[PDB]
């Protein structure tokens, strides 16, 4: 299926924001097949949040993820100036990666 | 061809004595059409496992 993301997000530095991702599919393996990517304007994307119960190495604890039912959530504790980028969620459940519409997070 | 040839083949002989002397055959009415009635559902999600 196709993923749905808000058009843009807004939040003051210091507070927390939440990005929604509805439309994640599932299979006989599990329900945690959700990943997030951050792409700054003028460069390639980078894997930030995948397997929301965990997180990759070299990534600060500011980026957190969760999922309730068929909706995924991206929780960012602290907002900084270098956080203005497009955040896409990806569903890789049925052996097929699908990228959402994306959101514009500005501080 | 005819009941005479049928009872000849049954008795395995070209000469048949007086009387029935055997049972010719058994009548079995065959079918003339087919009646299939499966269920009406949607496509099975086989992609969720494979």
Nearest residue of chain A to residue B47 (CA atoms)? A94
Per-residue DSSP letter, A81? G
Phi, psi at A70, each rounded to 5°:
-95, 15
- CA gap A72, A76 in Å, rounded: 13
Which H/E stretch holds residue A13?
A: none
DSSP result, A42-76: TS--EEEEESTTS--TT--TTEEEEEETTEEEEEE
- CA gap A36, A44 in Å, rounded: 14
- CA gap B24, B34 in Å, rounded: 30
| Separation in Å, CA A86 to CA A26, A36, A46, A54, B14 | 25, 10, 11, 21, 98
Final resolution, Å: 3.8
What are the residues of chain A with a beta carbon less than 8 Å away from any beta carbon of chain B?
26-28, 94-95
Is residue A85 classed as helix, strand or coil in its secondary structure?
Answer: strand
In B, which residues are within 8 Å of A26 by CB distance?
48
Which of A1, A27, A31, A33 is best to mutate for the B interface (most B CBs within 10 A)?
A27
Q: What was the elucidation method?
A: cryo-EM
Of A70, A79, A38, A69, which is closest to residue A55 (Cα–Cα)?
Answer: A38
Q: Which two tokens stand for residue A89?
A: 């969620």
């Amino acid at each position: 299926s196709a993923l749905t993301q808000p058009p843009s997000a807004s939040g003051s530095p210091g507070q927390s924001v939440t990005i929604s991702c509805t439309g994640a599919s599932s299979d006989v393996g599990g329900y945690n097949y959700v990943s997030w990517y951050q792409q700054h304007p003028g460069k390639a994307p980078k894997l930030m949040i995948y397997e929301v119960n965990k997180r990759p190495s070299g990534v600060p604890d500011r980026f957190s993820g969760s999922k309730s039912g068929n909706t995924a959530s991206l929780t960012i504790s602290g907002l900084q100036a270098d956080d203005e980028a497009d955040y896409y969620c990806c569903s890789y459940a049925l052996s097929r990666v699908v990228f959402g519409g994306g959101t514009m997070l500005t501080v | 061809l005819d009941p005479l040839s049928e009872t000849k083949c049954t008795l395995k002989s070209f000469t048949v004595e007086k009387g029935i002397y055997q049972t010719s055959n058994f009548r079995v009415q065959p079918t003339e059409s087919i009646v299939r009635f499966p269920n009406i559902t949607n496509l099975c999600p086989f992609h969720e496992v494979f």
